[PDB]
Amino acid sequence: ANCERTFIAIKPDGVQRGLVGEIIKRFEQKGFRLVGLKFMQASEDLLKEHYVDLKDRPFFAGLVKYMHSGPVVAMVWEGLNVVKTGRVMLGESNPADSKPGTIRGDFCIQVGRNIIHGSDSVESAEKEIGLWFHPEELVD
Amino acid sequence: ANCERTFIAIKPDGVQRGLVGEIIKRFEQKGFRLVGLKFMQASEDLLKEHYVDLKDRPFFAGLVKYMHSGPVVAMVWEGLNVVKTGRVMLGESNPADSKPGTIRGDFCIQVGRNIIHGSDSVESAEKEIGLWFHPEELVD
Amino acid sequence: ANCERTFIAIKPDGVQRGLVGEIIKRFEQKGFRLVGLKFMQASEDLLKEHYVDLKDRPFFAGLVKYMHSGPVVAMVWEGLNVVKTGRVMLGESNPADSKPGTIRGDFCIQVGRNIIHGSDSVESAEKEIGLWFHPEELVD
Amino acid sequence: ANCERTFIAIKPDGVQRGLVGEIIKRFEQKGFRLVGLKFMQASEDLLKEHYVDLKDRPFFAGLVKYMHSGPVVAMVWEGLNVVKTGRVMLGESNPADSKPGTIRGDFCIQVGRNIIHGSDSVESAEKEIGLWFHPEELVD
Amino acid sequence: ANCERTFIAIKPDGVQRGLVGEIIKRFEQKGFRLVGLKFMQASEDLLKEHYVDLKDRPFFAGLVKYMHSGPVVAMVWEGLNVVKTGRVMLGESNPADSKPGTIRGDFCIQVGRNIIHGSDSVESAEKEIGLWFHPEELVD
Amino acid sequence: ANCERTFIAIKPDGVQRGLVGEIIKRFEQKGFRLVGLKFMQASEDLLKEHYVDLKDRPFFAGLVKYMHSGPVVAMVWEGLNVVKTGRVMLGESNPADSKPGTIRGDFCIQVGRNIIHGSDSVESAEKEIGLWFHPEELVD
């Protein structure tokens, strides 16, 4: 009914600069609850199936090394229609078309090293959280 | 010329959670002045003519009891074309289509228990303030 | 047990500049609840018994006219030992000795036209709220 | 490649009220760097070629006197496609169509005394900075 | 030299209300880096050795059940003399003597259900992080 | 009477990280006005008489090169007893004794590369502004 769970991630640029506080705020003050917050670098074992559909791209190697550069923060949120709300409130991956008020539209400049990744659909969200978060990791 | 006066209200959810500070801020820092700020629960004598046009709705009783649950904050603002500016800066009552940067688009999740009510037109504003604020209550 | 109620007021400088949002915030985010929020100019009928103990001062007339200049906001808060917490979090009336982080220590410059008035003791608070807020005005 | 430089200015209303901090913030936290920040009133020698294309307007004299009223802040920013990003993040000069989240859409009320001026194109930016900032004034 | 690591925790009140964003901010904007951020409820296996020195207290059972009520956030920070800086910037556990500007002095009201726990000494910090964070959990 | 003018500067760390917005805010929202805001790197011609009294120190060369590393922002403020208010609101140069709520007590970690420099006395302020700001640079 209202137990839909999404996933939000922080790129190495976000942490090397340091913005996680407001990133958490934009969901916390909204009303969405968090069930899982894990910190890691994820190595390369998980940054192959996460972008498995993007493996046939020229930028796959460079971008995956860019993500692998440093540690990355992982969050899981739940709320009514949360998946759609997150993507629009995050903003388009291309800063050129990114209205003010969205996280990616307020801290991201270039398409290359973007800041935030989020699930487009419920199936993607559940698959990703299964890949990353063990069932005991989450809470209620 | 520039004496147009509007009305903004706070639902019981807004106060039971507590957000009135930023709600006031979004108008105060804008430049609009306030002429009236009264706090009450309004009983049921005023929550019948306020939604008199919505009396023929299945959700009228439940929603009016939800509003009657706790006390509600009432504000009056004035400014150039303030009525139109308030509604757009507040955001659509449906969070599904609510761009970031609007009060209802930054703290409201579900259509049922919305947060903010505002006058759609000048006539509605004047009728409501007559229903709620006595002429001596306001200031200049 | 925890029903102690205090009083906080806004000088005409605070509103003519406009700072009520953060003033409300500093108590709202703290956890204190509000039972009464009334807006008025208070005329001169209430600005004689409020400072009745200060009537024998050279600055009484000038300061009371300064307060009477414009409308003033009145608030009532409740919380555990709220009266003591409010005064320290407000800061000393003299900005010269006013540590950062207090409302009067972050927006007030000169002793003359100070910004915030608050009850020093429970008896003063109850007397003032009786003078200003009628029993039906407050809520629970 | 990424050395494109723009220009942002502060109207006398912005400083007489005082908002330069958040105005700087909206670009600083974004990632854009600043190469030049000069404070002056600019007299009337520069407020004739800045609006030379607007000289044939009925409001030219009144608006130029309004700008000449007080001192004005001048800033220069650089970033990828910064010129386009600044104008959209600033918001339309007409507050009537100004979505929330933009500087002009969050602090400006009337078209007459607007708050922020910015370069529409690279050529305008370079011409203006040549008119205002001497080459030694800027930094790298 | 500068690798000293501390520990900060969030009580169930902090999350059930929701304040983790600003709590993270107060350290992130300061300059301290984080090496570990894990979310759990910790059961009762870890809330016996954490307060082993407080086992001989009348409030031990009630307080440990209060902490066990909900999930709790765990953070680890590193910086020059970070342990001392954290405790003073957090504020005294007793709100009665808690100057404004400290996290516990800006969101905590009563001694009973306090908000933040932090290591008093380096030895306590290392013992606690050994109890909670596995060596592979942390990063560099 | 109230025309006392002080000086505040931004170290290269402050700009290379980027914090000038809040630094300006802490004075702007207070009420102090600014008469001069110039941006430069100042070369070494001015970073010899500024610290002429500190020339007989072992850290003079290293610290002066650290300041010379990048450009530095210069500001001038005026207000009632502004010089004393600035220094206390800035906080002690040593972060070890720096209460929360002060700029240096909220963003500085180590004594070596401090963030903010300010005039201790009126004579120092006037001498410094004479060294840096030409009389025509300032405004009224």
Side-chain angles (χ1 to χ4, degrees):
Chain A
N2 46 264
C3 303
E4 313 82 3
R5 303 174 184 86
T6 182
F7 172 81
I8 302 297
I10 310 300
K11 255 76 178 195
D13 282 331
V15 290
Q16 77 190 16
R17 168 145 49 108
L19 299 171
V20 294
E22 28 276 324
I23 303 168
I24 294 186
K25 280 281 303 306
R26 296 303 175 88
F27 316 134
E28 153 264 13
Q29 101 288 67
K30 185 57 171 178
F32 292 155
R33 299 168 59 254
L34 64 155
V35 326
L37 171 52
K38 191 181 175 299
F39 197 13
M40 82 222 71
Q41 199 160 355
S43 300
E44 303 280 14
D45 64 315
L46 288 185
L47 316 180
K48 292 190 299 300
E49 190 177 357
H50 168 42
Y51 291 136
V52 58
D53 300 1
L54 280 310
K55 68 189 174 300
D56 49 357
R57 298 306 305 263
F59 334 98
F60 181 84
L63 266 302
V64 77
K65 295 311 293 176
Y66 153 77
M67 176 177 296
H68 178 267
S69 60
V72 287
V73 183
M75 305 189 305
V76 172
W77 297 89
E78 58 94 1
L80 281 307
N81 196 246
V82 56
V83 45
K84 170 59 61 180
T85 62
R87 295 227 59 175
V88 56
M89 85 174 64
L90 262 36
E92 166 60 27
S93 29
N94 178 27
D97 42 354
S98 56
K99 307 306 145 298
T102 78
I103 298 95
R104 302 206 287 186
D106 297 330
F107 305 91
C108 181
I109 47 178
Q110 31 196 148
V111 291
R113 50 174 224 262
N114 93 90
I115 307 304
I116 306 300
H117 209 73
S119 174
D120 54 353
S121 66
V122 45
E123 302 81 4
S124 304
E126 54 87 11
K127 178 186 302 179
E128 188 280 340
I129 64 182
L131 292 182
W132 288 63
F133 286 90
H134 301 348
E136 64 279 16
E137 305 183 19
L138 313 183
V139 300
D140 178 73
Chain B
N2 46 264
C3 303
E4 313 82 3
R5 303 174 184 86
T6 182
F7 172 81
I8 302 297
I10 310 300
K11 255 76 178 196
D13 282 330
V15 290
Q16 77 190 16
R17 168 145 49 108
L19 299 171
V20 294
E22 28 276 324
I23 303 168
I24 294 186
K25 280 281 303 306
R26 296 303 175 88
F27 316 134
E28 153 264 13
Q29 100 288 67
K30 185 57 171 178
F32 292 155
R33 299 168 59 254
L34 64 155
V35 326
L37 171 52
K38 191 180 175 299
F39 197 13
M40 81 222 71
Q41 199 160 355
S43 300
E44 303 280 14
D45 63 315
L46 288 185
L47 316 181
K48 292 190 299 300
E49 190 177 357
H50 168 42
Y51 291 136
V52 58
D53 300 1
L54 280 310
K55 68 189 174 300
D56 49 357
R57 298 306 305 263
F59 334 98
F60 181 84
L63 266 302
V64 77
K65 295 311 293 176
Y66 153 77
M67 176 177 296
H68 178 267
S69 60
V72 287
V73 183
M75 305 189 305
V76 172
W77 297 89
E78 58 94 1
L80 281 307
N81 196 246
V82 56
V83 45
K84 170 59 61 180
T85 62
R87 295 227 59 175
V88 56
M89 85 174 64
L90 262 36
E92 166 60 27
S93 29
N94 178 27
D97 42 354
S98 56
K99 307 306 145 298
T102 78
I103 298 95
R104 302 206 287 186
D106 297 330
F107 305 91
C108 181
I109 47 178
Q110 31 196 148
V111 291
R113 50 174 224 262
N114 93 90
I115 307 304
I116 306 300
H117 209 73
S119 174
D120 54 353
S121 66
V122 45
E123 302 81 4
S124 304
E126 54 87 11
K127 178 186 302 179
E128 188 279 340
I129 64 182
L131 292 182
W132 289 63
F133 286 90
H134 301 348
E136 64 279 16
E137 305 183 19
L138 313 183
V139 300
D140 178 73
Chain C
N2 46 264
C3 303
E4 313 82 3
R5 303 174 184 86
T6 182
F7 172 81
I8 302 297
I10 310 300
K11 255 76 178 195
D13 282 331
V15 290
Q16 77 190 16
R17 169 145 49 108
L19 299 171
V20 294
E22 28 276 324
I23 303 168
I24 294 186
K25 280 281 303 306
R26 296 303 175 88
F27 316 134
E28 153 264 13
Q29 101 288 67
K30 185 57 171 178
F32 292 155
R33 299 168 59 254
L34 64 155
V35 326
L37 171 52
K38 192 181 175 299
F39 197 13
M40 81 222 71
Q41 199 160 355
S43 300
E44 303 280 14
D45 63 315
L46 288 185
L47 316 180
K48 292 190 299 300
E49 190 177 357
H50 168 42
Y51 291 136
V52 58
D53 300 1
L54 280 310
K55 68 189 174 300
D56 49 357
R57 298 306 305 263
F59 334 98
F60 181 84
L63 266 302
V64 77
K65 295 311 293 176
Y66 153 77
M67 176 177 296
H68 178 267
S69 60
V72 287
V73 183
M75 305 189 305
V76 172
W77 297 89
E78 58 94 1
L80 281 307
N81 196 246
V82 56
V83 45
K84 170 59 62 180
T85 62
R87 295 227 59 175
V88 56
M89 85 174 64
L90 262 36
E92 166 60 27
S93 29
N94 178 27
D97 42 354
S98 56
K99 307 306 145 298
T102 78
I103 298 95
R104 302 206 287 186
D106 297 330
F107 305 91
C108 181
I109 47 178
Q110 31 196 148
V111 291
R113 50 174 224 262
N114 93 90
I115 307 304
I116 306 300
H117 209 73
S119 174
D120 54 353
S121 66
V122 45
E123 302 81 4
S124 304
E126 54 87 11
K127 178 186 302 179
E128 188 280 340
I129 64 182
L131 292 182
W132 288 63
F133 286 90
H134 301 348
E136 64 279 16
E137 305 183 19
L138 313 183
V139 300
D140 178 73
Chain D
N2 46 264
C3 303
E4 313 82 3
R5 303 174 184 86
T6 182
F7 172 81
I8 302 297
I10 310 300
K11 255 76 178 195
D13 282 331
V15 290
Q16 77 190 16
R17 168 145 49 108
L19 299 171
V20 294
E22 28 276 324
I23 303 168
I24 294 186
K25 280 281 303 306
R26 296 303 175 88
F27 316 133
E28 153 264 13
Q29 100 288 67
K30 185 57 171 178
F32 292 155
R33 299 168 59 254
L34 64 155
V35 326
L37 171 52
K38 191 180 175 299
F39 197 13
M40 82 222 71
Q41 199 160 355
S43 300
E44 303 280 14
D45 63 315
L46 288 185
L47 316 180
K48 292 190 299 300
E49 190 177 357
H50 168 42
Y51 291 136
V52 58
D53 300 1
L54 280 310
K55 68 189 174 300
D56 49 357
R57 298 306 305 263
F59 334 98
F60 181 84
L63 266 302
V64 77
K65 295 311 293 176
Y66 153 76
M67 176 177 296
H68 178 267
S69 60
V72 287
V73 183
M75 305 189 305
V76 172
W77 297 89
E78 58 94 1
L80 281 307
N81 196 246
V82 56
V83 45
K84 170 59 62 180
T85 62
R87 295 227 59 175
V88 56
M89 85 174 64
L90 262 36
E92 166 60 27
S93 29
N94 178 27
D97 42 354
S98 56
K99 307 306 145 298
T102 78
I103 298 95
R104 302 206 287 186
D106 297 330
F107 305 91
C108 181
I109 47 178
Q110 31 196 148
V111 291
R113 50 175 224 262
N114 93 90
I115 307 304
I116 306 300
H117 209 73
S119 174
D120 54 353
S121 66
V122 45
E123 302 81 4
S124 304
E126 54 87 11
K127 178 186 302 179
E128 188 279 340
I129 64 182
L131 292 182
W132 288 63
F133 286 90
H134 301 348
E136 64 279 16
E137 305 183 19
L138 313 183
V139 300
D140 178 73
Chain E
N2 46 264
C3 303
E4 313 82 3
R5 303 174 184 86
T6 182
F7 172 81
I8 302 297
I10 310 300
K11 255 76 178 195
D13 282 331
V15 290
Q16 77 190 16
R17 168 145 49 108
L19 299 171
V20 294
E22 28 276 324
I23 303 168
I24 294 186
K25 280 281 303 306
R26 296 303 175 88
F27 316 134
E28 153 264 13
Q29 100 288 67
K30 185 57 171 178
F32 292 155
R33 299 168 59 254
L34 64 155
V35 326
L37 171 52
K38 191 181 175 299
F39 197 13
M40 81 222 71
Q41 199 160 355
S43 300
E44 303 280 14
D45 63 315
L46 288 185
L47 316 180
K48 292 190 299 300
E49 190 177 357
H50 168 42
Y51 291 136
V52 58
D53 300 1
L54 280 310
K55 68 189 174 300
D56 49 357
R57 298 306 305 263
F59 334 98
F60 181 84
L63 266 302
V64 77
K65 295 311 293 176
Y66 153 77
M67 176 177 296
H68 178 267
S69 60
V72 287
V73 183
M75 305 189 305
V76 172
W77 297 89
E78 58 94 1
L80 281 307
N81 196 246
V82 56
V83 45
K84 170 59 61 180
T85 62
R87 295 227 59 175
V88 56
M89 85 174 64
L90 262 36
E92 166 60 27
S93 29
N94 178 27
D97 42 354
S98 56
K99 307 306 145 298
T102 78
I103 298 95
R104 302 206 288 186
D106 297 330
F107 305 91
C108 181
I109 47 178
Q110 31 196 148
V111 291
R113 50 174 224 262
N114 93 90
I115 307 304
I116 306 299
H117 209 73
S119 174
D120 54 354
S121 66
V122 45
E123 302 81 4
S124 304
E126 54 87 11
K127 178 186 302 179
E128 188 280 340
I129 64 182
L131 292 182
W132 289 63
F133 286 90
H134 301 348
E136 64 279 16
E137 305 183 19
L138 313 183
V139 300
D140 178 73
Chain F
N2 46 264
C3 303
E4 313 82 3
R5 303 174 184 86
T6 182
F7 172 81
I8 302 297
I10 310 300
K11 255 76 178 195
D13 282 331
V15 290
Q16 77 190 16
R17 168 145 49 108
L19 299 171
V20 294
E22 28 276 324
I23 303 168
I24 294 186
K25 280 281 303 306
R26 296 303 175 88
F27 316 134
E28 153 264 12
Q29 100 288 67
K30 185 57 171 178
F32 292 155
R33 299 168 59 254
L34 64 155
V35 326
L37 171 52
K38 192 180 175 299
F39 197 13
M40 81 222 71
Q41 199 160 355
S43 300
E44 303 280 14
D45 64 315
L46 288 185
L47 316 180
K48 292 190 299 300
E49 190 177 357
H50 168 42
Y51 291 136
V52 58
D53 300 1
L54 280 310
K55 68 189 174 300
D56 49 357
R57 298 306 305 263
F59 334 98
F60 181 84
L63 266 302
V64 77
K65 295 311 293 176
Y66 153 76
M67 176 177 296
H68 178 267
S69 60
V72 287
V73 183
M75 305 189 305
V76 172
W77 297 89
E78 58 94 1
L80 281 307
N81 196 246
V82 56
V83 45
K84 170 59 61 180
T85 62
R87 295 227 59 175
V88 56
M89 85 174 64
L90 262 36
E92 166 60 27
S93 29
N94 178 27
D97 42 354
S98 56
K99 307 306 145 298
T102 78
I103 298 95
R104 302 206 287 186
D106 297 330
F107 305 91
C108 181
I109 47 178
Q110 31 196 148
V111 291
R113 50 174 224 262
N114 93 90
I115 307 304
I116 306 300
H117 209 73
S119 174
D120 54 353
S121 66
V122 45
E123 302 81 4
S124 304
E126 54 87 11
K127 178 186 302 179
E128 188 279 340
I129 64 182
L131 292 182
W132 288 63
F133 286 90
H134 301 348
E136 64 279 16
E137 305 183 19
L138 313 183
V139 300
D140 178 73

